[PDB]
Amino acid sequence: DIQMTQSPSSLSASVGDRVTITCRASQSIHSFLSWYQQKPGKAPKLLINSASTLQSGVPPWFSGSGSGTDFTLTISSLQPEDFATYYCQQSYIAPWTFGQGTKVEIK
Amino acid sequence: VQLVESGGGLVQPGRSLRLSCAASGFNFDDYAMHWARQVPGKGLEWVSGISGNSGSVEYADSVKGRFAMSRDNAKNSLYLEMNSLRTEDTALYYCAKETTPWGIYRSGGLDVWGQGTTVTVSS
């Protein structure tokens, strides 16, 4: 494998705004892509698995979509808890790389 | 048990739009499949549905007389038609088959959700 990149590296939004974040792949990666959440100084949180399935206890306003090489995340309305980072990985074989993430700040 | 929906779009209030919900990985039976919608910031709801053996139509209070329905079992797909649209119909339509239409106690189904295609209305 995974050679990942994403854009934009920073974002500015208020409460209730529709935000998005896109990370793409160089080649076919199918559709089992995850989305993560990370607060500063705390444990990471999970939001989306396999780019279509919403887990139990995760609120439904986090929605993901995408197939093939292009992927995206969609939030219907921002929340005070939603100001954090995002990541997207894949586990086809076992080398381990990492991305650069993004940031959402108060405007 | 995978359901894929298509047919949404951005239309004015009053213009119809024929969407779809295709059932894949579904063994053929008398499944009663329903609809629901989601607004940002609140919980869940339910709209209407049709049971098996054709016929057996029902709706809610505010969606009667303006929803057209037809089911084709050969294509494993559904055609649904709108009429006299309003401003509260900005919905991402989910089809949920409830996956247990047994001969005895056909009610109490376990709803399974699809993906949906967004429909946006704007005056």
Going along chain A from its start, the domains and CATH numbers come out as 4-106 (2.60.40.10)
Q: Which residues of A touch B41 (CB under 8 A)?
A: 61, 77
Number of compact structural domains in chain B: 1
Query: A97 Cβ partners below 8 Å, 6+ apart?
Result: A2, A3, A4
- CA–CA distance, A24 with A54 (Å, rounded to integer): 21
- CA–CA distance, B50 with A21 (Å, rounded to integer): 39
Instruction: Encode burial over B27-43: b for 16+ CB neighbours within 10 A, e otherwise.
Output: eeeebbbbbbbbeeeee
- CA–CA distance, A4 with A100 (Å, rounded to integer): 9
Question: How many Å is the Cα radius of gyration of chain A?
Answer: 13
Elucidated via: cryo-EM
Nearest-by-CA chain A residue for B4:
A52
| Rounded-to-5 percentages of helix, strand, coil across chain B | 0, 35, 65
- Would you call B108 an interface residue with chain A, using a CB distance cutoff of 8 Å? no
In terms of residue numbers, what domain contains B23? 2-121
Instruction: Using CA atoms of A67, A55, A35, B7 in order, give the dihedral in degrees to the nearest 10.
Output: 30
Query: Which domain CATH number covers B48?
Result: 2.60.40.10
Instruction: Evaluate whether A20 touches A75 at the Cβ level (below 8 Å).
Output: yes
- CA–CA distance, B38 with B45 (Å, rounded to integer): 7
3-state SS, residue B118? strand
- Would you call B38 an interface residue with chain A, using a CB distance cutoff of 8 Å? yes
Q: Which of A30, A35, A63 is nearest to A49 (CA)?
A: A35
Nearest-by-CA chain A residue for B117:
A65
Q: Which of A77, A85, A92, A100 is nearest to A35 (CA)?
A: A85
Chain A, 29-68: which have a CB under 8 Å from a chain B CB? 52, 60-61
